[PDB]
């Protein structure tokens, strides 16, 4: 929808930009912001959550050529490394693809919340905005943002601008 995103939004991570009679203005939705954060936070904590301890292991550098045993001690340690390295490449890749889809869905969700709220008093412009079909002054706007907009109130006004003129 929003083919772009807003630079200069520093109140939070997701937000509302409105325009009415009283003028334009902006404000961040803190609840869905923290929602994204708390997930990333916890995902991140599980990755960097306390590692192993290891003490007396095998030798991994060698001065002389010994043949068979040494050949095996180095194969073992190389085979280890190669696997753990794969694990780490895959982990990050997965975790990232997720961290993206997580945050894209959070935006997505806020939009729906806002659409269900406006019910039949507004239409989706196509770029992730709404054309609200009534006089929505600044009080009315925060009423939407803070989850209290009663549609049953502006129904008649809106409904009629939409289907007439």
């Amino acid at each position: 929808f929003i083919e772009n995103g807003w630079e200069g939004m520093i109140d939070g991570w997701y937000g509302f930009r409105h325009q009415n009679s009283e003028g334009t203005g902006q404000a961040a939705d803190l609840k869905s912001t923290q929602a994204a954060i708390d997930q990333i936070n916890g995902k991140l904590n599980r990755v960097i959550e306390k590692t192993n301890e290891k003490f007396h292991q095998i030798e991994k550098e060698f001065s002389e050529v010994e043949g068979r045993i040494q050949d095996l001690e180095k194969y073992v340690e190389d085979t280890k490394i190669d696997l753990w390295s794969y694990n780490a490449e895959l982990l990050v890749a997965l975790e990232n693809q997720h961290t993206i889809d997580l945050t894209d869905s959070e935006m997505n969700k806020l939009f729906e919340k806002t659409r269900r709220q406006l019910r039949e008093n507004a239409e989706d412009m196509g770029n992730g905005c709404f054309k609200i079909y009534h006089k929505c002054d600044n009080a009315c706007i925060e009423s939407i943002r803070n989850g209290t907009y009663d549609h049953d109130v502006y129904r008649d006004e809106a409904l009629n601008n939409r289907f007439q003129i």
């Epitope: 803190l30 609840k31 923290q34 954060i37 936070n41 904590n45 960097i48």
Partner: nanobody, 126 residues
Framework: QVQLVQSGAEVKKPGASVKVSCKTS????????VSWVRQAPGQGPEWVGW????????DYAQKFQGRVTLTTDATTATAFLDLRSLRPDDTATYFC???????????????????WGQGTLVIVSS
């Protein structure tokens, strides 16, 4: 620097309710929630609830639910705790403490109960 000054001891009777203030300072109030823990004399601490100063979200311990209400006032930078229907059981000393990090990037868990109120005694006697 960073501190949490709580209200002086209140004393209330079995029916009534109570409200305890926790004034904060030295850090920006809204980027950190608040955890509340109480302590019946001689026993160990038990957790009461938590509220975010960023998102207004709360999580009460299910033991109290109903009886307990957490709020915050960003202007004065204060968290409040309201407990109703006080039993004599609830006679305890009540602590607030900084907890969770809100908005900001993330982690790990570096607090998470960084700093605590000096404690505020509540006595429920008739």
């Amino acid at each position: 620097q960073v501190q949490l000054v709580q209200s002086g001891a209140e004393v209330k009777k079995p029916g009534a309710s109570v409200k305890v203030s926790c004034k904060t300072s030295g850090y920006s109030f809204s980027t950190y929630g608040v955890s509340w823990v109480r302590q019946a004399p001689g026993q160990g601490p038990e957790w009461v609830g938590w509220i975010s100063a960023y998102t207004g979200i709360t999580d009460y311990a299910q033991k109290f639910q109903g009886r307990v209400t957490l709020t915050t006032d960003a202007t004065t930078a204060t968290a409040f705790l309201d407990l109703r229907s006080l039993r004599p059981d609830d006679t305890a000393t009540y602590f607030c403490a900084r907890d969770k990090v809100q908005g900001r990037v993330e982690v790990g868990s570096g607090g998470r109960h960084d700093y605590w109120g000096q404690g505020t005694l509540v006595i429920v006697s008739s």
